[PDB]
Amino acid sequence: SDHRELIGDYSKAFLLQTVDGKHQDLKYISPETMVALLTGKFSNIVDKFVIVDCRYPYEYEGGHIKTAVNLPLERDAESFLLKSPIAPCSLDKRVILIFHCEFSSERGPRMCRFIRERDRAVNDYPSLYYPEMYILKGGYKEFFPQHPNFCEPQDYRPMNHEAFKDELKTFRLKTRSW
Ligand SMILES: [Cl-]
């Protein structure tokens, strides 16, 4: 039994415990749950889980969660996740996606909604390639101070970092829209 609704293709319940977050309709997990996945607490059930860090490349380069992939542009995310979907090695097992940015307030959530839109578009309702997707509450900023040893390099570079103003500006000119 679970007290929540089913995952996106209505096949089963969400596996992870969720916390309250700004977007009322999205599912958020805490840093602690992120570490349970990374330490293999759900290995019997989760075949693969992809951590999508939606921050700009310099932020990611200054310190990210181990194994995370950096996909800041919608275009990169669609190509990496939807061109050749990442599927479980066993039907019994699940694939899960986790998105986050610096605070998981804007960037993260947006990329998450965008991937579900495209996943809906290319499938017959209600099947999905990624029916179960969460947001890391607090983003890298809250994660780093708590589990520094799960990040590489062991540092944090804010988007607003004074020495990367130029980098910030250059990168935004690469987005599909402002
Ligand atoms: Cl973009």
UniProtKB/Swiss-Prot annotation:
Similarity comment: Belongs to the MPI phosphatase family.
Organism of derivation: Homo sapiens (Human)
Active site: C101
Classification of source organism: Eukaryota, Metazoa, Chordata, Craniata, Vertebrata
Complex and partners: Interacts with MAPK14 and 14-3-3 proteins.
Positions of the Rhodanese domain: 45-152
Residue positions, PTM Phosphoserine: S84, S177
Protein name: M-phase inducer phosphatase 2
Segment of the intact protein contained: 387 to 564 of 580
Subcellular locations according to the entry: Cytoplasm, Cytoskeleton, Microtubule organizing center, Centrosome; Cytoplasm, Cytoskeleton, Spindle pole
Primary role: Tyrosine protein phosphatase which functions as a dosage-dependent inducer of mitotic progression. Directly dephosphorylates CDK1 and stimulates its kinase activity. Required for G2/M phases of the cell cycle progression and abscission during cytokinesis in a ECT2-dependent manner. The three isoforms seem to have a different level of activity.
PTM comment, free text: Phosphorylated by BRSK1 in vitro. Phosphorylated by CHEK1, which inhibits the activity of this protein.
Segment forming the signal sequence: none
